[PDB]
A = this chain, B = another copy of it.
Amino acid sequence: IANRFTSNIKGLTQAARNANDGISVAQTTEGALSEINNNLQRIRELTVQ
């Protein structure tokens, strides 16, 4: 049972690290999307003009 618990603890810690990496991926993609959105807003203003 101690072996099983050690395996589970190590796996869960590594999974937490993986989830942190995924959060980083999401943040980077969202920043790129925000810049694209600002460009689109400016283009719409130019079209209205």
- Report which A residues bind B (CB closer than 8 A): 3, 6-7, 10-11, 14-15, 17-18, 37, 41, 44-45, 48-49
How many monomers of this chain does the complex have? 2
- A14 cross-chain contacts in B, Cβ below 8 A: 45, 48-49
- Name the distance in Å between A14's Cβ and chain B's nearest Cβ: 5
- A6 cross-chain contacts in B, Cβ below 8 A: 41
B3, A45: Cβ atoms under 8 Å?
no
- A41 cross-chain contacts in B, Cβ below 8 A: 3, 6-7, 10
- Name the distance in Å between A33's Cβ and chain B's nearest Cβ: 11
Q: How far is the CA of A7 from the CA of B48 in the complex (A)?
A: 10
- A37 cross-chain contacts in B, Cβ below 8 A: 3
